[PDB]
Write a protein that binds this ligand. Sequence first.
Ligand SMILES: Cc1cc2nc3c(=O)[nH]c(=O)nc-3n(C[C@H](O)[C@H](O)[C@H](O)COP(=O)(O)OP(=O)(O)OC[C@H]3O[C@@H](n4cnc5c(N)ncnc54)[C@H](O)[C@@H]3O)c2cc1C
Ligand SMILES: Cc1cc2nc3c(=O)[nH]c(=O)nc-3n(C[C@H](O)[C@H](O)[C@H](O)COP(=O)(O)OP(=O)(O)OC[C@H]3O[C@@H](n4cnc5c(N)ncnc54)[C@H](O)[C@@H]3O)c2cc1C
Ligand SMILES: CCCCCCCCCCCCO[C@@H]1O[C@H](CO)[C@@H](O[C@H]2O[C@H](CO)[C@@H](O)[C@H](O)[C@H]2O)[C@H](O)[C@H]1O
Ligand SMILES: CCCCCCCCCCCCO[C@@H]1O[C@H](CO)[C@@H](O[C@H]2O[C@H](CO)[C@@H](O)[C@H](O)[C@H]2O)[C@H](O)[C@H]1O
Ligand SMILES: [S]
Ligand SMILES: [S]
Ligand SMILES: [S]
Ligand SMILES: [S]
Ligand SMILES: [S]
Ligand SMILES: [S]
Ligand SMILES: [S]
Ligand SMILES: [S]
Ligand SMILES: [S]
Ligand SMILES: [S]
Lengths: 421, 421
Amino acid sequence: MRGSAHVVILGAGTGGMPAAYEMKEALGSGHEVTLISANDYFQFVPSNPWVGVGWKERDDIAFPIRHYVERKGIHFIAQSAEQIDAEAQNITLADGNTVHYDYLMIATGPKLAFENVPGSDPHEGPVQAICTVDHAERAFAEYQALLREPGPIVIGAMAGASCFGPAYEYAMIVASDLKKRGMRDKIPSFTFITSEPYIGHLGIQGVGDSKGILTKGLKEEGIEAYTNCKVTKVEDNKMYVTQVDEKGETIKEMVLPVKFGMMIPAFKGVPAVAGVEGLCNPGGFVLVDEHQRSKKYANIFAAGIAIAIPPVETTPVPTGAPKTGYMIESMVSAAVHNIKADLEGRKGEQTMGTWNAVCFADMGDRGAAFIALPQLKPRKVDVFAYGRWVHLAKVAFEKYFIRKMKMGVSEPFYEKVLFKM
Amino acid sequence: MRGSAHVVILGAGTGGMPAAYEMKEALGSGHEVTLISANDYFQFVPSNPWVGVGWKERDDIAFPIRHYVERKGIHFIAQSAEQIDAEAQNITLADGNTVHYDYLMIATGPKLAFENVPGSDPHEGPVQAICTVDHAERAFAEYQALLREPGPIVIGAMAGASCFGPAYEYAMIVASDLKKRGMRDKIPSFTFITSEPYIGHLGIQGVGDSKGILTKGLKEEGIEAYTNCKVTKVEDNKMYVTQVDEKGETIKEMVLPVKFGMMIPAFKGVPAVAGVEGLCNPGGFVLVDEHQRSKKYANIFAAGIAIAIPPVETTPVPTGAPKTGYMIESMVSAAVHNIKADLEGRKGEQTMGTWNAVCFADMGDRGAAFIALPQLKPRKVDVFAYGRWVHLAKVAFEKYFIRKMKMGVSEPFYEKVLFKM
Ligand SMILES: Cc1cc2nc3c(=O)[nH]c(=O)nc-3n(C[C@H](O)[C@H](O)[C@H](O)COP(=O)(O)OP(=O)(O)OC[C@H]3O[C@@H](n4cnc5c(N)ncnc54)[C@H](O)[C@@H]3O)c2cc1C
Ligand SMILES: Cc1cc2nc3c(=O)[nH]c(=O)nc-3n(C[C@H](O)[C@H](O)[C@H](O)COP(=O)(O)OP(=O)(O)OC[C@H]3O[C@@H](n4cnc5c(N)ncnc54)[C@H](O)[C@@H]3O)c2cc1C
Ligand SMILES: CCCCCCCCCCCCO[C@@H]1O[C@H](CO)[C@@H](O[C@H]2O[C@H](CO)[C@@H](O)[C@H](O)[C@H]2O)[C@H](O)[C@H]1O
Ligand SMILES: CCCCCCCCCCCCO[C@@H]1O[C@H](CO)[C@@H](O[C@H]2O[C@H](CO)[C@@H](O)[C@H](O)[C@H]2O)[C@H](O)[C@H]1O
Ligand SMILES: [S]
Ligand SMILES: [S]
Ligand SMILES: [S]
Ligand SMILES: [S]
Ligand SMILES: [S]
Ligand SMILES: [S]
Ligand SMILES: [S]
Ligand SMILES: [S]
Ligand SMILES: [S]
Ligand SMILES: [S]
């Protein structure tokens, strides 16, 4: 209000949850912090591929938000925003209620654009998805139906996708789970389809020897792999794939039967955010400046997958670069600090810093991880690692992050890196 | 050098010339400022369409650089950079000589991408260009050859172009010049082809009533107009045009004979800059941050058409947004201030400010001008004006800008706006 600003945070995910705590901590008792989110529970997204092969249960990676944020003085509304009026600064919720804000922080993550590919929606076909825990449980269910009645497998990533790690990870743990059940030899074919220009491109033009190691890993497991692919439609339990060459010209078309399938979809901005005029690029991602502030509305900030990051490369089949957890945190921190300063007559000069991608994938007893920065080669850090220690690190970090979402966050969030001192 | 940094400015155009003066002024006698440019003369680019119909002479809009910058202590090298080594911080010139720098400011403007359209190069066909004074003189020459032997005219802008004003302006003054010579009725057809989704889109989704007024202006002059066009090739004195619809689907193909033609080309980054690894987007435009600093090299800055600005809209046929003079100046000012601060232990926090487009077109006794900001609608200023006063303003500003390039620049460059006090 007129002297004690009301700060609304939209989306209680990887960026939104900590943003609510950090926001509340920074603003203190004199300001209202409201967290709005479509679900009443928080999920740890990087654990979803394991849920999708049944190595993890929902109960292990998700929990109810309300008590933990409210014990902190944050108001929680478990409702989806349907409309945003930036002029009037009102948010219309699904139930019709409206919420007013003085500052909006948008952390709504991705809309899964199943509509780019007719038939590709998990509910209308064999092609599943593992990005949300609801979808991963459903993926597991179809996985069990493959066990009872074996048929061809197709795993991969769609045109326009930006999140390739999980596709490779899921392909590997499925192959692995098939072996551990002695069922692997029952599979007619096992294909990996990706829009990447080559295996291990990962949306980032490769990191370390990702090409060689992912290539060998796929061959090792008897998975046939195709790149520069776009799926045009899913129909009659068949995936229609077009493969192009360096200059976008078609070099073949394939029709693949699928009994069990998982393709990572392209991400768009959610409709409520994409619907705000002049706020977003054509993909529905919020245009912001270095400080996380909307270019159009000075009291709207944004962070996480929700924001637009300009492409630095152009591939035969459209692909995007990933937005990963450490960079999301830096964006969150910057947005909070800069809002706090708006409330105190300063201009917040904090930025998210250097673009970077960090990803960790657990395969069982060991994992793979990479770090790349900045976005364009030649990089200052370009490492791809595999080992048992990646597994331990993933396990520890999940445990840590979830504990922090329950206990609360101050916080220069990543001093997990005090394992030096 | 080790304590008195050497600042090189690449490109002596609308942004580069003032950047050299402002740089020298800000750094004083203790630092070396070198200006490198492919031509030994400065040209006033906005005057080129008039040169292309013969209303202006080269001698009126261009002048030799050397004396004016050297009398200011700036070193001038009238040589084109062929290669840039960002690691070693050396620039290789056309003649083989190399120049070392501690800070590089890149202001090289556009490469005219005639190669996007086979046959479209001015030297290999009837399709001319008016972006450089050399090309506009050549355009005028072909214009006189049309006078002696009348045939079809085709004026417009290519796919990927970002500079539409001048196409409309040139079409109008040609029509006008035809009338004043009583030759207008000798023309079989007069076609206007543009990649814009509609007339008066101007790369900026329209400004004021540009649609209605440009539409009417073209009809008024008997010019037939097509939008959503891309020229695929120029061959045998014929332009091959494909017109698409809202979803990129072809709704017709045309083969147009041309006796006289002028299409604005798509712009790319020049090869020396585009060739620096990791410096540029796929178009060869320098990736910079709000402060004009290269994202990859902390001692490389950039300004003007040379820098990359992310798209905010997506059209059926690829088009770009314009980079116009006031915004270029703001970029220049920011880059200079921020370099000066790098030389003094500070961090320069200056930015170019709000995106904006300002364009003035003289038609003879009157002109048209527009101002739009910021880039995305709804805007804070969205005006399209026509009148005799636009003409006077254009004339005055040309006179002013050229005088300033000769006398020198301090300078919060635009206080021409003191016509209020
Ligand atoms: C399968 C998978 C694996 C990943 N693995 C890694 C990894 O290993 N390491 C890493 O660093 N990152 C990884 N990522 C990438 C990234 O870190 C995650 O996607 C992360 O969850 C993104 O955080 P976010 O806050 O932007 O979006 P999210 O975590 O998706 O949060 C968005 C929230 O907004 C809510 N929401 C959506 N629409 C509305 C609405 N209209 N109104 C109200 N609320 C709404 C959603 O319910 C959700 O809670 C992974 C991504 C996925 C999909
Ligand atoms: C026809 C036309 C009309 C325009 N009308 C308007 C208008 O009315 N108002 C407005 O505000 N703007 C207008 N513009 C847009 C814009 O202001 C101009 O294009 C402006 O000149 C851009 O300035 P710049 O410094 O980035 O590039 P330029 O002015 O093109 O300068 C680039 C310089 O770099 C040099 N160079 C190129 N390569 C090398 C190399 N390898 N080594 C060394 N030097 C090199 C070139 O010789 C040139 O001198 C117009 C543009 C054009 C083409
Ligand atoms: C995190 C995002 C990346 C994508 C997600 C995960 C993709 C799946 C990875 C599959 C890799 C499988 O292939 C595996 O690779 C490494 C080679 O580097 C081999 O391992 C080799 O290097 C490792 C160390 O890095 C040594 O400990 C080992 O002694 C050596 O054999 C394994 O013997 C091989 O089995
Ligand atoms: C600067 C970038 C924009 C593109 C470059 C230039 C494009 C060419 C412009 C062609 C316009 C010709 O059409 C011209 O438009 C205006 C209408 O607004 C009319 O003019 C009308 O409005 C003006 C004021 O704005 C009045 O002074 C006038 O009394 C009235 O008739 C002219 O009678 C008409 O002849
Ligand atoms: S999903
Ligand atoms: S990802
Ligand atoms: S990833
Ligand atoms: S973007
Ligand atoms: S690299
Ligand atoms: S040109
Ligand atoms: S332009
Ligand atoms: S323009
Ligand atoms: S860009
Ligand atoms: S607007």
